């Protein structure tokens, strides 16, 4: 007879469905953060501020395409608030392509940001690593001068 | 009926084989061309050698 606790296997299958839903959520998030990686590692050689805004709205709308269960997860809130907080590259990054960029201007900014740099590969992957909304005051002083 | 022109048949055969060869060649060259065009569309000033 061995009447077993079927609730255990009901929880098992419910957790399996939730696991598949989370697998889909994280596949979409992997695509999202891979796009984030490409817009991160780009050395700002061809990208424009308008292109940054395009990427922002594209990521926002593909994120909002999540279905009800996939939209209500905590990770969805995390990524959405991340995008809203970064809804900022176009605002400050208009200093590199400007004529104000030079060797000592790089030096004074590199002192202000305290990080070390290599001139050959000027990758925004480390420029964004020093988050701009975090150090807006010093870079604006680097801007204003 | 007469002696068929085997020259025409071998011409067709060599045309077909060289056509397949050149089709593969053009596929490879198109891949090379598109990849180098995508490379050169960007200025490549701050991208490492």
Curated annotation (Swiss-Prot), chain A:
Please state where this protein is localized. Cytoplasm, Cytoskeleton
Q: Domain of life here? A: Eukaryota
Recorded coiled-coil stretches? 50-66
Q: What does the similarity note say?
A: Belongs to the dynein heavy chain family.
Q: Which disease is it linked to?
A: Charcot-Marie-Tooth disease, axonal, type 2O: An axonal form of Charcot-Marie-Tooth disease, a disorder of the peripheral nervous system, characterized by progressive weakness and atrophy, initially of the peroneal muscles and later of the distal muscles of the arms. Charcot-Marie-Tooth disease is classified in two main groups on the basis of electrophysiologic properties and histopathology: primary peripheral demyelinating neuropathies (designated CMT1 when they are dominantly inherited) and primary peripheral axonal neuropathies (CMT2).
Purpose of the protein: Cytoplasmic dynein 1 acts as a motor for the intracellular retrograde motility of vesicles and organelles along microtubules. Dynein has ATPase activity; the force-producing power stroke is thought to occur on release of ADP. Plays a role in mitotic spindle assembly and metaphase plate congression.
**Entry domain remark:** Dynein heavy chains probably consist of an N-terminal stem (which binds cargo and interacts with other dynein components), and the head or motor domain. The motor contains six tandemly-linked AAA domains in the head, which form a ring. A stalk-like structure (formed by two of the coiled coil domains) protrudes between AAA 4 and AAA 5 and terminates in a microtubule-binding site. A seventh domain may also contribute to this ring; it is not clear whether the N-terminus or the C-terminus forms this extra domain.
Kindly state the subunit structure of this protein.
Homodimer. The cytoplasmic dynein 1 complex consists of two catalytic heavy chains (HCs) and a number of non-catalytic subunits presented by intermediate chains (ICs), light intermediate chains (LICs) and light chains (LCs); the composition seems to vary in respect to the IC, LIC and LC composition. The heavy chain homodimer serves as a scaffold for the probable homodimeric assembly of the respective non-catalytic subunits. The ICs and LICs bind directly to the HC dimer and dynein LCs assemble on the IC dimer. Interacts with DYNC1LI1; DYNC1LI1 and DYNC1LI2 bind mutually exclusive to DYNC1H1.
Its recorded name reads Cytoplasmic dynein 1 heavy chain 1
The organism encoding this protein is: Homo sapiens (Human)
Q: What is the lineage of its organism?
A: Eukaryota, Metazoa, Chordata, Craniata, Vertebrata
This protein's gene is called: DYNC1H1
- Which stretch of the intact protein is present? 1308 to 1452 of 4646
């Amino acid at each position: 007879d061995t009447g077993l606790l079927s609730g255990s296997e009901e929880r098992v299958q419910v957790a399996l469905e939730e696991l598949q839903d989370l697998k889909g959520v994280w596949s979409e998030l992997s695509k999202v953060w891979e796009q984030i990686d490409q817009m991160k590692e780009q050395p700002w050689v061809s990208v424009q501020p308008r292109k940054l805004r395009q990427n922002l709205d594209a990521l926002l709308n593909q994120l909002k395409s999540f279905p009800a269960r996939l939209r209500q997860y905590a990770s969805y809130e995390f990524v959405q608030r991340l995008l809203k907080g970064y809804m900022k590259i176009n605002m400050l990054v208009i200093e590199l392509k400007s004529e104000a960029l030079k060797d000592r201007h790089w030096k004074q900014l590199m002192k202000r940001l305290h990080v070390n740099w290599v001139v050959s590969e000027l990758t925004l992957g480390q420029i964004w690593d020093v988050d701009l909304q975090k150090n807006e005051a010093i870079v604006k002083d680097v801007l204003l001068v």
